[PDB]
Design a binder for this molecule. Structure first.
Ligand SMILES: *Cc1c(COP(=O)(O)O)cnc(C)c1O
Ligand SMILES: *Cc1c(COP(=O)(O)O)cnc(C)c1O
Ligand SMILES: *Cc1c(COP(=O)(O)O)cnc(C)c1O
Ligand SMILES: *Cc1c(COP(=O)(O)O)cnc(C)c1O
Lengths: 412, 412, 412, 412
């Protein structure tokens, strides 16, 4: 029972950071593929992917580990961009070239998704405009700038506010639950129109001149919000509104990017080209933190190290993800078929799935009982569960996990 | 001439980020010890230490690389603290135990120095107080919260402001150049008194109730500001003022900590125990980014991964630094002796040295000509140079660098 | 043609301040009762009441003028509250005693409605809470604090923002036009529920902890917004939500108070007792500016003159208004009967009437042609007209104005 | 003893608003010339002028009262500028014509000094610049925008902050007490240089780009700060700095303007032409509140009433003040001669005098004992007394007051 002792001692020295309700503690020793092992030898099937960090497995993909060990002994990661280096150049080229839009783009590297978002804030404000529009339910980070854009759980913004002024939050086109009580699955256009109208006919009329809005920040699919997928043409309509006033569109792909939805960039599913994109988590292959902010060249700006290790890893990650897309979409069909009817709302694309329950207590029990069966799941939104297995998962491993989930749901 | 081509192509894809004046470009291939090698085979002696990131050499210390390669294959770095793990527990124990003060402390891990500072802002505001005092010339990071505390170069805060309200900046006790034109070396007490008076008799009288000031942020020695060392009893006096009103003291050791000044924590040189401390850069051994925010337990608060790789590395870093302190102070005497009279102001402690020139152009030339001789140096403040060789540097390597610097200064 | 010359010369020396579209210029010489006379001898029937300032006629009521001339020669108006004086005491007593709620209250005097609102902001924040909720379409003043709460026309908040942080705007229960496209006249409960739900299930869930919301600011009937009257039980429901979290209710009666709606305080029509109330405009009888902020005694706080002239006038105003209420409601029935079917939406209570047209151009023409007939009207909202004759208007004078309005509407 | 009863009852209904220490209560019935009479028949010689409001006597000047009674019966004061009217045109002409600078200017009317300052904030920000510099010890109003610029007593900014971001406060050139401990009377140039240096070499270097500073706000002589008169060439040097970066100079004359210092505009004593000027208090003749914001025409911008009563009064006030300047400067010599040696620092110009005592308790006693002798005085700064008799005071009345003050100072 090494775990209990480690947990107790750790709780003494570490700052408090738990969910509500809090999940069962896990003292991990190591990982392999889609499996995690605690210090007591217990095995766990991972359906969390570390929320993106481990899209390619644990501790990472074999080819990525190989790259890391080699590069680390040459030039590591100073989280700085001063030192020109081949790895940095190669990853930059891939990120600008494979991202949506065939216009010239540039990339700014950072150490995390929140830093990538902080950089995006600077980019959109470089225009001279002062206001930013974001969405209720959205999550973009915890640093002061990023948390000003975040609006997931009120408690997360407690005590230390107020936050950055000039940020306005509006309803997201959540097809299952929204302020208009519209069924976004049956009437997608109606929901999209109400959301666009709220911005254009109210926010832009009563509160802020649209010409002073620097940009609109959004997740192509809300992660922390509960894996909420908006109507297919929502971003096309949002862009129409934005273009009308010269407002920039910032696509936060920190959690949905790099293969999660079966596309290199989740926004591709919505056939929309954003002005700025943020990446992180999976970009580092599960080995290390690295963030990236891709943006139209015409928006460019005006430490002492070289981030070679992180970039070398990211470069390999991009190649593996691209090679895996067909597999991701194939395995995704299994989740689509097997998850049907397992929740009050079952929504997903690629390997990005969400299960929402009208009963929060039921949601908590499903996660709790699943953990007791050796299946790792994470909550999302108010009463949903995110089902996000590593992109490298096999059909066989997927069914092992789904069988456990189905059995748990049947008894809870 | 592989370098030129890499530089050109990289400038096309990467966001603009250069100094003023901009330093000579460097396309690094790999490093070993205190030496750096570019893609064209050119060798460089490093007197920058990556501003802390590479305190233990390039790409890092052999023992740290060993730890990294091993741990990376077990459980890497998710930049999250959810996953309990032995490495995390061990580093946490070292950071709370070896930091100043024998009272109970806790530690919150992050991915960088700016994130560590963002966390410290939340910690001091958890009290309910709204104002923060920082120092002119100080540098604490670039994210929205941290940059609100930063006041190094005005251009760095251009375009995208205003910033976080409630932050007040006051003069730092810079012994060489200050608003009072006091020679802080001859009259340290006078300078300290003027600085304390400015806060207590003006800021606290005219602008903000001291009882509403959450904390005072400071660097024990200003880094970006030009390696400005304040009078020895400055922090003792600052703490007296703070205790009087229940104001917290936040010691930013991101650049001066972990051995740079011959002490594990630079504040030790000032015999003062802070309430909160931030660490980063060197903590990750030059292999990866990791930040830490240490604070009194009574200030504690109320993702899904395990930062084992970064913590395992940090744990080893702490042991190596502690073992190296005697060496650092010994080599420091060489710099103290050899740097005398080489600038209009020569100031330093341990291996933290600053050379300030009344003539900025002269400062720029010294750095430029040194680069042409194969010696890497970084500017600081308005017209100073920071001389910060890796802590693992030998007497022989130190003299090679000092000989070059002396020769350059003599001809410029 | 003295007018044209005065207008031209005045436009040279005065700062630009015009509506869009701009109304016809008026160079007033004097007034009497409900009639205004320009410098060229042209007579105008006033249906604007100076938006409250002249509720009792022009230049004011005879009894008020008498009081003013007498008091002015004793102790005038220093816009200060330092000097104790009988007039101040008497008005204070009337304001605390006749305002809703039988609990102990206090009053803070100021010089305008925007200053009264600025004072209310301080009052609600004295609690220690940092957030404020206000309504889209609302208007509370133009000074920095008040304009942060205002959200009438975006252009009014242009250029000089961002504004006070921590202010969140939500939809008002406008029965004619709202984000839900609900007909608030046919389904009032549905609209009220959607508005309350937006705050409780979205704002309080995603954005801000309700326990940190200092207060909710609202107009009992939106003035600048277009004389928008919410469902009768809206404030009762709003108060239920507020009480649940200890949030204060601030009732801005600067435009709707003092008899306009047939009640001393417009909120009386909604059977709700607020925590704070702001008054201005009519309070000064049309003779001078004076604002008042009435609030529960338990919220009290912790220059060198005496506002006797303004208070003496206000005291008389209160008595005249109370005596006139029966008359106001009687004349109101005439407007109710005669205005029916004259606009796409006809809404009103007492002598507070609004006429909204789906066609903005039609709205502008009605106001313009009316001015050419000698009837003064003001626009409101996006395409509405406010019809607010002085409370002292006779049935005969009312019909003269209504006949003109009807004829204009019939030809436009 | 009618007073005591009025005070008790008034304290029950009125919001708390007292000084620290609090002055003796005064229940004023009426006034005449420079004399005030309470409800119990007690007579008081006024050396406060209501801090400007009553520069022309109590309740006001006979000629002003005449104008007021007449105009009030024609068109009063709606605190609005919509209604063109002769009085408004005439006052506007006088304010633009007689203010410093022969370039084209415009004027925006408001209801108070704080509103005039709020308007000035909008004017300087209309440029697009976001930062504002103000001075420690300064006072510009209590509304949210104005209080953000104010920095007199910290307690005044307690509880309800933080305030408007982008406002930076720097030391004022106070010749008696400043952060540099410079004797500004013996070494004025030294003090001016230190103040200019603080802004140019520190604020503009470390904190904010000067090109982003909209304006510098200042009082030509700090009022609440203690009637602090800066060196004669301070504003000339301040303007040189401002012109260098296109920064605007805002001169707040709300307390020092309109004859107080022997000049129509106090800045005239410093031979400097500002870009924006604010006026209030005395402008209304002691009869009513009216504010004015005068500014260069090239800075112009892009309710329903006519402020005729207030403007008619202001127009007369301007003529009387201009006629009285010779008298003010003459009587001023008496105060200069008679006040010498009566305090630790005696400073003044025209009829604007300040007496500072190193002993605060002594300062409080002088004011208290003076009140007991029937002489009204107000405190200022930390331990000073402002001596500001009405501009209409006779030599005989001045000596009566000075004799009392001298006797009190001799026994305290
Ligand atoms: C997780 C997440 C972030 C935060 O990324 P970090 O590396 O933890 O700072 C930002 N945006 C989105 C959409 C996320 O899911
Ligand atoms: C470099 C530095 C920071 C920034 O650390 P990052 O890891 O680059 O975010 C913060 N504070 C100080 C004192 C620094 O020197
Ligand atoms: C007009 C108005 C104000 C502004 O009053 P002022 O005296 O012009 O400052 C504030 N609130 C409401 C509801 C108003 O109608
Ligand atoms: C008194 C004063 C103000 C405030 O004027 P109000 O009419 O009370 O708002 C502003 N500035 C200065 C310099 C003052 O002395």
């Amino acid at each position: 029972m090494l775990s209990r002792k480690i947990i107790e001692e750790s709780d003494i020295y570490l700052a408090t950071s738990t969910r509500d309700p809090e999940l069962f503690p896990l003292v991990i020793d190591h990982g392999e593929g889609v499996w995690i092992y605690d210090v007591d030898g217990n095995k766990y099937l991972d359906f969390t992917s570390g929320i993106g960090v481990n899209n390619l497995g644990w501790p990472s993909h074999p080819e990525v580990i190989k790259i890391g060990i080699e590069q680390m002994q040459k030039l590591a990661h100073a989280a700085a961009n001063d030192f020109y280096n081949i790895p940095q150049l190669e990853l930059a080229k891939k990120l600008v070239t494979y991202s949506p839009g065939n216009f010239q783009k540039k990339v700014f590297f950072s150490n995390s998704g929140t830093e990538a978002i902080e950089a995006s804030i600077k980019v959109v404000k470089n225009t001279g405009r002062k206001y930013i529009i974001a969405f209720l339910g959205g999550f973009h980070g915890r640093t002061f700038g990023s948390i000003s854009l975040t609006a997931s759980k009120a408690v997360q913004r407690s005590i230390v506010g107020p936050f950055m002024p000039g940020v306005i939050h509006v309803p997201y086109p959540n097809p299952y639950r929204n302020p208009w009580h519209i069924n976004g699955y049956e009437n997608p256009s109606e929901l999209v129109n109400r959301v666009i109208e709220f911005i254009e006919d109210y926010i832009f009329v009563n509160l802020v001149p649209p010409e002073e809005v620097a940009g609109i920040f959004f997740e192509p699919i809300q992660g922390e919000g509960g894996y909420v997928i908006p109507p297919k043409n929502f971003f096309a309509e949002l862009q129409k509104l934005a273009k009308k006033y010269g407002i920039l569109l910032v696509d936060d792909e920190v959690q949905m990017g790099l293969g999660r939805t079966g596309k290199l960039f989740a926004i591709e599913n919505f056939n929309t080209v954003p002005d700025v994109i943020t990446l992180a988590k999976a970009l580092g292959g599960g080995i290390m933190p690295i963030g990236a902010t891709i943006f139209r060249k015409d928006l460019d700006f005006k430490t002492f190290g070289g981030n070679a290790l992180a970039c070398a890893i990211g470069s390999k990650v991009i190649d593996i993800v691209k090679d895996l897309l067909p597999h991701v979409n194939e395995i995704g069909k299994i989740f689509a078929e097997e998850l049907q009817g397992l929740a009050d709302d079952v929504r997903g694309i690629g390997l990005a799935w969400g299960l929402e329950y009208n009963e929060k207590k039921v949601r908590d029990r499903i996660i709790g009982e699943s953990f007791k069966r050796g299946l790792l799941l994470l909550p999302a939104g108010r009463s949903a569960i995110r089902v996000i297995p590593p992109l490298v998962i096999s059909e066989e491993e997927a069914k092992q996990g789904l069988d456990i989930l189905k059995k748990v749901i049947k008894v809870v």
